[PDB]
Capsular polysaccharide biosynthesis protein (Bordetella pertussis Tohama I), 679 residues
Amino acid sequence: TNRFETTCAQLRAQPQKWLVTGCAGFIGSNLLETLLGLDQAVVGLDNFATGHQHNLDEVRAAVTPEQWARFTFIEGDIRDLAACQRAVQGVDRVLHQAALGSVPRSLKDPITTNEVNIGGFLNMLVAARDAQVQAFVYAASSSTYGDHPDLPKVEERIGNPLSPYAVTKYVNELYADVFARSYGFSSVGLRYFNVFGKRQDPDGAYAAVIPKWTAAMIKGEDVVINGDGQTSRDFCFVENAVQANLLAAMAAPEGANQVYNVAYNARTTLTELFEHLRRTLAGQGVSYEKAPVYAEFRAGDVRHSQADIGKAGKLLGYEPAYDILRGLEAAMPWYTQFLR
Amino acid sequence: NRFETTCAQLRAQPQKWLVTGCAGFIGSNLLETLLGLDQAVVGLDNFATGHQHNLDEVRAAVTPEQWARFTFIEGDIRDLAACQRAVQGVDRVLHQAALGSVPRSLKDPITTNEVNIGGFLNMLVAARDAQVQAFVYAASSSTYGDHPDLPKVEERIGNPLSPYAVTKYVNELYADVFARSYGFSSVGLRYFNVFGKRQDPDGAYAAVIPKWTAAMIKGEDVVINGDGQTSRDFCFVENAVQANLLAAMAAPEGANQVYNVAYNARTTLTELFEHLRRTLAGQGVSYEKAPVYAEFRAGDVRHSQADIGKAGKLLGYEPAYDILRGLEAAMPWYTQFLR
Ligand SMILES: NC(=O)c1ccc[n+]([C@@H]2O[C@H](COP(=O)([O-])OP(=O)(O)OC[C@H]3O[C@@H](n4cnc5c(N)ncnc54)[C@H](O)[C@@H]3O)[C@@H](O)[C@H]2O)c1
Ligand SMILES: NC(=O)c1ccc[n+]([C@@H]2O[C@H](COP(=O)([O-])OP(=O)(O)OC[C@H]3O[C@@H](n4cnc5c(N)ncnc54)[C@H](O)[C@@H]3O)[C@@H](O)[C@H]2O)c1
Ligand SMILES: CC(=O)N[C@H]1[C@@H](OP(=O)(O)OP(=O)(O)OC[C@H]2O[C@@H](n3ccc(=O)[nH]c3=O)[C@H](O)[C@@H]2O)O[C@H](CO)[C@H](O)[C@@H]1O
Ligand SMILES: CC(=O)N[C@H]1[C@@H](OP(=O)(O)OP(=O)(O)OC[C@H]2O[C@@H](n3ccc(=O)[nH]c3=O)[C@H](O)[C@@H]2O)O[C@H](CO)[C@H](O)[C@@H]1O
Ligand SMILES: [Cl-]
Ligand SMILES: [Cl-]
Ligand SMILES: [Cl-]
C-alpha cells in the first residue's frame, strides 16, 4: 500500500476533526467530500465570494446522511479574525483553501486580493496558532516560481513574483516560515500546479483554461489559445491535490514546516490540451468541429511549467494516481451534466 | 555634491510633496527640511505612534511663511479614501507611515500586517492613480534577515526573521510588481537604524538610542540585550533626509530601485553606550553607572553594516554625519525634551 491508503485507513479508524476553508469552492469541496467520506467531523468556512452553495449541495447528495451530519458549515470571512477563531475551535487539522485566485483578477483589483490572501491568511494562521491545532496545511501556488527559468521547478529555487496574486501566495509561505521561527508553529504549504477537476467554476470572467474551454466546446463557441499554443503546463487532477492535503496534514515533524510541489511532473501544451478535450468530449457525445483561434500572448504568462514532485514523494509518500488524460475522462462528465 | 544641486533646484522650482507619517520621527524631520526649502507639503498621520508635539516643534523651527505651505490630514493609510485625498495634486510622495518595532510585530502580527502591507498598498495604488512624479517609500535593513555576508549588498538578502521584516519586504515586492504591470516607478530606501531628534524615547518599543539616552539623562539603569558585541550601522536622520530627496528627484535610471541608506560603519552596543555617556558628559550630564548585560533579544540580527555604493553612484548620496557627529547634534534635543 502507498502512504495515502494507510492514511485513509488510519483516519477512518481514528477520526480527527478538520477545518476546510473555501469548502464551498473547487478544491475545498473536493476535500470536504473526501474527508466526510472517511467518517471525519469537518468544519467549513466560506463567504461564497467565488464558491457556490450548489457545490455544498452536491457534496451533501454524494455522502451518506450519517457523514453529512458531521459537517458544520460557517458562512464567514477569513478577513474577520473572530470568524477564523470560531472556525478553528476544537479543530485538530486545518486545510486552508480560502483565497481569491486569478492573477488577472489581482491585476484589476490588487487591494481586494491582498486583503483576502495575505490579511485573511494571517488571521487564519494566528487563529490556528492560538487554538493549538495539530496541523495547518495551506494552499500555495506555482506562481511563487515567478520568472525563474529552471525546469522542472524545484522547491528551493524560486524567482520574483510577477503579479499581485503571486505576491500574496509567496507571502503566505513567508509568514508560515516566520511563525515556525518565532512561535514554533508548524505548517505545510502546497504549491498547486494548475489543478482541474469537477466543480472548478466554468462561469465567471476569471475561469481556468480547462473549465472555460470545456464550456465553450459544449456550447460550440470559439476556443482561443493565448499565444502560439506550445505554452505548456503541469495540469494536476484534483484528486492528486486531495491526496497531498491529507498526507501533509498527517505528516510527522520532518514533513512539516515544509513547502511541496503538488502536480504530476508532466508537460502538456495548450494545443495538446485542446486535442485532449476534443477527444474526451467526443466520448460524451459532444461534437466540436471548430479549430482553436490563436491570438496574442497573455501578459505575465510563463511559457513552460513542469513540477519536480520528488520532495512530496520522498517526505509524504505522494503518489498521484491521475495523469491529465485520466482526470479529463473522469471530469468531463461532470461538465456535460452541469452545463446541460 | 548632488544634494546641494537638488536643494537649489527645489528652491527655484518648488514641488508639492506628501509625507505620510509626518508626525513621526523621520517624517517630521523630512517635513522640517522640505518646508525649509520653501516646498508645499501635505501630511497624513493618525497619531498611532507619532505626536502632535513633533508637528508643533516643526512649526516653531520654520518661518510662518513656510508653515503656511503645510496642509495636515489626520487620517489612516488603511483608509484608501484618506490616501486618495492625500495624494491629490501631489508631485512627490515620501511614504513613512508604518509600525516599526520588530518586538511589536511579534506580539501583534495582525496589526503590523494591516498597516505595513495593507496601508502601503493603499498608498501605492492611490499614488499610481494620481500619477505622482515620484514615490519613495521606507524599506528596512531587516529585509536582509539571516544572510551572513557583511557588508550588506542590495542584491544579496536572506529570509525574514520577524513579522515586521515580512511587511517591509512585501513593500519592495509590490513596488517591483507595480513597475512590471502598470509602469509605475518607485524608490525603496532600506534604512539602517536611523536615529536623531524626535525619535520617541517614551515608548514600550523605543529604539536603543532614545531609550538609553532617556535612561541616562534620568539616571536609570541601562540594559544591553546580549554580550554587547552586537553591531549596527547607525544612520543619523539627516543622512536619511538627503536620501529621500535625492531619490524623489532622481531620473528613471535611478527609480524602481532599492538603496541602502546608512554610513557603512560598525558600532557595537557596548561602544554605543560609551558614545552616549561621552556625548552627554560634553553637555554637563553625568552617567557613572555601568551597563547591565542581559540575555539576547528574540530574533535580533547580530551584525548589520550597509554598503552604500549603490546610493552613491545612482543618487549622489554622500552622507555627512557619522554616528558620533549625529549623536552630538541629537543629544541636546533629548536633554531639552526631558529636563
Ligand atoms: N488551479 C487552481 O485552482 C489553483 C492553483 C494554484 C493555487 N490555488 C489555490 O488553491 C485554493 C483554492 O482555489 P480554488 O481553485 O478552489 O478556488 P475557488 O474560487 O473555487 O475556491 C476558493 C473558495 O474560497 C472562498 N473564499 C474566498 N475569499 C474568502 C474569504 N475572504 N473568506 C472566506 N472564504 C473565502 C470562495 O468563496 C471559494 O469557495 C486557493 O487558495 C488558490 O489560490 C488554486
Ligand atoms: N531606525 C528607524 O527609525 C527605522 C529603520 C528602518 C525602517 N524605518 C521605517 O521608517 C518609517 C518611519 O519610521 P519612524 O522611525 O519615523 O517611526 P515613527 O513611529 O516615529 O513614525 C511613523 C509615523 O507613522 C504614523 N502612522 C503609523 N501608522 C499609521 C497609519 N495607519 N496611518 C497613518 N499614519 C500612521 C505614526 O503615527 C508615526 O507618526 C517606517 O516605515 C519604519 O519602518 C525606520
Ligand atoms: C498562478 C495561478 O495558479 N493562477 C491561477 C490560474 O493559473 P494559470 O494562469 O496558470 O491558469 P489559467 O487557466 O488562467 O491559464 C493557463 C494557461 O491557459 C491559457 N489560456 C487561458 C484561458 C483561455 O481562454 N485561453 C488560454 O490559452 C493561459 O494564457 C495560460 O497559458 O488558474 C486558476 C484559474 O485562474 C487559478 O485561479 C490559479 O490560482
Ligand atoms: C533597523 C532594523 O533592522 N529593523 C527595525 C528595528 O531596528 P532594531 O530592532 O535593530 O532597533 P533597536 O535599536 O531596538 O535594536 C538594536 C539593538 O539594540 C538592542 N537593545 C534595544 C533596546 C534596549 O533597551 N537595549 C538593547 O540592547 C536590541 O536588542 C538590538 O540588538 O526597529 C526600528 C524601530 O526603531 C525599525 O522598525 C527598524 O526597521
Ligand atoms: Cl469583511
Ligand atoms: Cl506606542
Ligand atoms: Cl492586508
